């Protein structure tokens, strides 16, 4: 008795046909990176983040601030490039 995946399966994207023409990470480290990025996305299956308390998860922040200082993007950029 099969069920139907809800949303995307993780590796369903890449082509199994013609594996030799696919680029691999021969680095352990590249893999580690890609994996840690994958572990930060909001998946549809029971996950560690879910049970172990991301602490309210998504939260819309009521902000009582002082307004952020207004500074010119392009000017600053130019000056820094120069420096």
């Amino acid at each position: 008795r099969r069920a139907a995946p809800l949303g995307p399966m993780p590796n369903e994207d890449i082509d199994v046909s013609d594996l030799e023409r696919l680029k691999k990470y021969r680095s352990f480290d590249r893999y580690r990176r890609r994996a840690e990025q994958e572990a930060r996305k909001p998946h549809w299956w029971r996950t560690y983040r879910e049970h172990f308390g991301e602490e309210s998860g998504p939260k819309d922040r009521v902000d009582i601030g002082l307004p952020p200082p207004k500074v010119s993007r392009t000017q600053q950029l130019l000056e820094r490039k120069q420096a």
Binding site: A3, P5, P10
Partner: peptide, 19 residues
Amino acid sequence: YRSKPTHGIGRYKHLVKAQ
């Protein structure tokens, strides 16, 4: 688990051919 939607999530061997 076969009954579940998440079945075969850990399936890899089709990605690497070593035979």
